């Protein structure tokens, strides 16, 4: 049958902020997915244990014999125009 996936869109678009055009896309991924859940458990992997056990090792040994002086609050906000509702006709 070469499946098509109902409850899928026909095309996808996104603004490109370097070349100012849009650019659409008509090949759409067609895998139903529901309840994707992300994990945080990590078993005798090479890459992770050294990076984590080593930072905590250095910290606890250092305190066994603070440096980063007190932080400074700040603020910034974007400019947010108002939303209005105007309706006109040509009839």
């Amino acid at each position: 049958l070469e499946p098509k996936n109902p409850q899928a869109p026909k095309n996808i678009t996104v603004y490109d902020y370097y070349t100012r055009k849009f650019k659409t896309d008509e090949l759409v991924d067609q895998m139903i997915v529901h309840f994707s859940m992300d994990g945080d458990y990590i078993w005798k992997e090479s890459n992770e244990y050294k990076t984590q056990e080593e930072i905590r090792d250095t910290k606890k040994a250092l305190i066994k014999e603070r440096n980063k002086f007190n932080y400074n609050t700040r603020e910034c906000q974007t400019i947010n125009p108002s939303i209005r509702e105007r309706g006109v006709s040509t009839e």
């Binding site: 095309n11 996808i12 678009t13 996104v14 992300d38 945080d40 990590i42």
Partner: protein, 49 residues
């Protein structure tokens, strides 16, 4: 069109609890959260006489 029938079955999986090396939470974790909606195109017309 009278088409009654019924069945059942079950999967499941092996069980085993190790709990020697267990219980790590990678403390300085990172994630990527947004509040953007998806976008698409269409075109529409009405017949011209």
């Amino acid at each position: 069109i009278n088409f009654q029938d019924t069945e059942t079955r079950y999967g499941g999986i092996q069980n085993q609890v190790v709990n020697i090396n267990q219980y790590v939470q990678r403390n300085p974790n990172f994630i990527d959260l947004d509040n953007i909606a998806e976008l698409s195109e269409h075109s529409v017309n009405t017949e011209r006489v």
